[PDB]
Amino acid sequence: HAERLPYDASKWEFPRDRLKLGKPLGRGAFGQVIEADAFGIDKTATCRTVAVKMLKEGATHSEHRALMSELKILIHIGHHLNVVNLLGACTKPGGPLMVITEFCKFGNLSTYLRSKRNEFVPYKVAPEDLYKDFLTLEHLICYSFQVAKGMEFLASRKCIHRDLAARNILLSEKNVVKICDFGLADARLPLKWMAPETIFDRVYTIQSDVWSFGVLLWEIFSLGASPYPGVKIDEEFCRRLKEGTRMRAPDYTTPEMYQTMLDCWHGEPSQRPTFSELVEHLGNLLQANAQQ
């Protein structure tokens, strides 16, 4: 499967001595995600800020492969605007295993959205300057549109994310969002983003990612709220879920967006929309929103 993917070190290998590791950006059992400086990793710059995911110096022989798979998969997928850009890696012996991606200034979308709760209006109005730097339904529909586009792309190159959530979406410059993974596909309570077929039968498909995409939409339109607020993720949660229970509409959604969340939460994988359809439907909503 993944282990069998090609790592062309001549094109991605980067000198560990050209990286000045900085402040941690996130922790994990696998190891860490650190901010850093790359001396001439790309060409349009001399010194660039990059994000680096790396294992613990005493990391298992298993994770070492997990991280190598991610590197191979990211390479296989190729470049897309809404997928965090892979810049390089460090496989050679000597230092720990490291994957290097572009740095996204504003970090994960969940945190970001939460900080704009008191800076959000559905639609801007004149003066129009009293709203400069406010989030609007257009922004939210756009973020969802972009993620759906990146997932369509992942589908296209036949890959699945496995843990699609707001915390794994990064806000870059000019309202451009990028899909990423701070983990190595847990205090992050991942069951909240899993489709029933995944929870009960541990089966991961592109359609279960669509279920996750539904939780992400609820996250975006709750302005960063936490999925299944207050609810205890236990035996009964898994049960109720399979029985057909879903979350109520978030605080800033629109009738259509909430319906789309529901569409994504169909109990039947094959009854859930597909990312292409989602990209088309969302695009419509975006364009329908501008009008009014």
Ligand SMILES: CNC(=O)c1cc(Oc2ccc3nc(Nc4ccc(Cl)c(C(F)(F)F)c4)[nH]c3c2)ccn1
């Ligand atoms: C304030 N800025 C940040 O906190 C920050 C962290 C960051 O961390 C990383 C560092 C390395 C990474 N490697 C990934 N893997 C990844 C990214 C996208 C996709 Cl689609 C897939 C997978 F596995 F699904 F193919 C895997 N995500 C990563 C995220 C990258 C950019 N900005």
